[model samples]
Target: GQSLRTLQGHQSAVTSLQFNDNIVVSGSDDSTVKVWDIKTGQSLRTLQGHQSAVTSLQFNDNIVVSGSDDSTVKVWDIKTGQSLRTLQGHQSAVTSLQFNDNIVVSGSDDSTVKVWDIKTGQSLRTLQGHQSAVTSLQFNDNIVVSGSDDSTVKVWDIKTGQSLRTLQGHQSAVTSLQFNDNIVVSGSDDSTVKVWDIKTGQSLRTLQGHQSAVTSLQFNDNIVVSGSDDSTVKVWDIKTGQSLRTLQGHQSAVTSLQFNDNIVVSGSDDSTVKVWDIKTGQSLRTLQGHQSAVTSLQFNDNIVVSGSDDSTVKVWDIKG
Candidate 1:
């Protein structure tokens, strides 16, 4: 819980963020993406090209891929800040996106998910079935999992572009999702989080506790951490479906969150970020500086990076 430096540049709210090694990349409502050097607290380059706000993005060592409200996805060279390619297909705003080694998967307000070949910038397949906007999605080696405003979650075969199974339970929009090979976890405006069996297409357990919309969530093999409009964060056992502990302190809605084995970091509408001990449910420190809500966040072994509505990003050193 150490406040290191605040980096400022964007003219509008910082909407999405991702980081690896010492580089942090952020997308903003200003229609630009900025790359920062964590150690120097300096803006390396401002990537400007998107016609509208950038809603989501992901980065690897070589490229930065981004989706925008302009109905397009763009790829950029990380080091040179040059535009590599622009991928166009979605008829509406792209809300969610993720990429692995060979493919990039994106969900849109058009109610379709598109799989794109990373190398050629070609649309490989279009996954269609959702009755409403696709709100969240994730993909790995073999399959893609998507959640929608249609109040359903779908599992799709990546290679064949076929729907494998449809999971229905949430009475409201599925707002966030995460999945690995074994399980799919979804958070919804229904004020609940559900764990699903990927192989059987069965609902494993419905976790109930958040008094408002479940806004964000992340899970590994052992635990699931969720943030909500209830101004709280809850940790749960993925296998047993039990609430481990509730961490509370934020004055407003918790919008984004991330965690590792030892710590949980949360950003909130309260204009602050808090670091917590995952096991003990104790608040370690609160980071304050931004004038508006913190909208997105990411953390690794050494640093925690947060983006906010105040048009800024803050990098914190968590080592001590």
Candidate 2:
């Protein structure tokens, strides 16, 4: 693994990013959203529509949904840099959003989630539960699952606006979670990750691996990956309720992480980004040069793109 190049723009912090096969879309506190050709490292477009900091974003192929401190979400046509629709009505900063199908399910700082009709830019309903702010959300199978600061994970029936289940395991806030047809896996401030039946809501296992709270987590294939305040990134087998490996190469807390099947990429408060062999628990490379914490990253085994507080999106080459 090696350092490729750095994208030097965005006078402010790079906030969020999304990756396609050859393209990368990054949003920044500079209030600009940029599209880049990852291989060539050329900026294709600087999407110019948001009035405030672009805080969060995600994309498929045709469009990217970008949210901002301006309390709005805009849909962009990738090739043309066209703002297809501007969804306005979040009471505060729109922090979490998913542009799926013909609908948009978005979360705001004011502790509310709204279901918006994309075709007409109409808000269908506002989901109000959880006495506190929503921290994590996963929607699929016509259901909405939300982890909240109120110390519970609530599942809603998206079709009828029905509250399906309210899961209670965390004595503190549930920070991150993911679910499939069988199980719901969640990470919490309780310093544990819990798994339960997605349909039955039955507790299956509680993995108390990290000595500190799990700040960020991801569920992929058969593993649960957690980034902790203890400066460790632990990979746990979802089916066996076993710890696969503990990654502790970083000198500081792991700020953020991205993983798929074979590899893991983590950026740390140590001002470095690391590539790791997920199964081996072995250090691959600790690429340097981020002047500050790496806040967000997107990667495959071939390449890595990380945005730091240093005002740049750093790209890394995995092929030697």
Candidate 3:
């Protein structure tokens, strides 16, 4: 049986979503982050503080960190709907947030990324190098990978806050990046994707063929999936640097891509999310209802969560 559920109420695009043990937390352009019960689809709490749009979010067991266009980073206690602290230092809007064990790292349009202590919400270190906005960030063990509007990817030493190396060669703004083992894959506004050598910051190979900007990227064990402004999702062979297949049918730019065991999900400016088969590049289902652009997505268990310009978060059940 096919089932659909719409979780609605925000007034702008949903920007980010993260799964907790039994709940889902979503940040939005509405300047609020809301927690939802996974089973009943009930709104648990709406956290408010940011003066502008909330752009990204991540949660630990009891604490939640959110970045916003208000140029601030905030830490919240999820259970009480109370903001614990505000780490205000970014000169521009904060774009991304990621947590590595005890630290919370954030990227911003201010052209700097910062690391903060989780408990105190105190700035630990500031990482600076990019000439443009830092759009996406991820931490793997001791290394931090950041994508920037400067058209470069930077790897940083998390412990020391030193930028270890920079990966260059993308022709336009690097929008997203992810690392798996020896490979660092990046998405760019230049309409191409590149895989790099993380240790040496070498450009390994470029994956090309998209007709527009590549906005999102994700890598699993053997494959890479990239979403592009061309309104298509392309799957690539990581080892060969080959374009294996492209998933079409989106009406606007594909903004995000996520993968699970056998399925791939993509969010798009067309205001819909599509679920695809990982192996064949065939779209299995389309989840629609957002009145504005769908900007980001993530998968958790049997459900797919999407963020959109419509100011609401939607969850879909993916049945295998």
Candidate 4:
């Protein structure tokens, strides 16, 4: 219902944001991550360690982790704004990270995914199979799913350090992945999104329409939302294998999407985040303020946080 409440303080672009309760943490191209108060739109603290752009971030309970182009993952004490420890074994830029109950998993340009103990700050084991950069990762219980530049998805056992199988078929690199119960959905540079039967290690269906690389994806219920280099967000009915609607208007590639009820929000290289009516495929409102491409977005009911290449994170008060 309302617009973005500009929270500006970075010298470069913002890349990622994660929300936990009333606090939001953001990573930026300026090489620093900041924690903010969601309700007051106030800057609470800043944590720094990476020598390059901070590309991704994730938080679980009291722990906050960040991935950077400097080839490291840094853990931070959210309350004190102090960087706890840096995980520095990856030989390339850390692209994404996700935390399970006890372990922290990261994907990087080094073409490997590593699991680390959150408490001990030790690299437990590395999952190796990807021939190119590992772009994204998702962990559920004992299963870890990794997407990579090799255009394939690999499932690994967290405890055994063994790759179970590879889901191969995409003609380009896989950029994002989301796990839903027994199914795994992935977006790729091949310009399509594929849904796989995790148990069977087989491709169930392929959703196509994006003319360029599919940059990001999210799945819930029978719906799939995808952002693409085609500069649009598409909604698909997974059961029917038909496109529900195409939300257009972004002038550049759409990088990420997050859903809340019937409202779908997306960020793009176009430098704005747009909220849309999922059922009608109509533009609801556009939030603008970031000076560079918006790379990531996250929401919690009434509020939305976005990260951009401009090195600043913006918080918007979404009334709907």
Q: Each model's TM-score, in the order given?
A: 0.97, 0.94, 0.95, 0.95
Question: Model 4 compared with the native: what TM-score?
Answer: 0.95
lDDT of 3 at 247: 94
Question: What would the per-residue lDDT of candidate 2 be over residues 1-320, giving only the tens digit for each residue?
Answer: 67777777688988888776788788999988998887777888989899999988988778888889999989888779999999988778887787687888887777777788877888887888778877767786488888888888888888777787888878788877888877788888888888888777787988887988787888865899988878899999988878889998888877688887778889887888888888898888888888987878888767888988787887888654
lDDT order, best first, reads: 1, 4, 3, 2
TM-score winner, 1 or 4: 1
TM-score for candidate 3, please give it: 0.95
Model 3 root mean square deviation, Cα atoms: 1.7
lDDT of the candidates, in the order given: 0.93, 0.83, 0.85, 0.86
Model 4 per-residue lDDT tens digits across residues 53-90: 88888876667799999999988888787788899899
Give the per-residue lDDT of model 3 (tens digit) for 55-115: 8888867888899999998999987989998988899999998875678889999999998
Which parts of model 4 have CA positions greater than 4 angstroms off?
A: none
Model 1 lDDT tens row, 1-320: 67788888899999999877787899999999999988887999999899999999999889999999999999999889999989999999999999877888999999999999988999999999999999999887789999999999999999999999999999999999998887899999999999999999899999999999999999998999999999999999988999999999999999999998999999999999999999999998788888999999988777889999999998887665
User: Model 3: residues >4 Å from true position, as ranges?
Assistant: 1-3
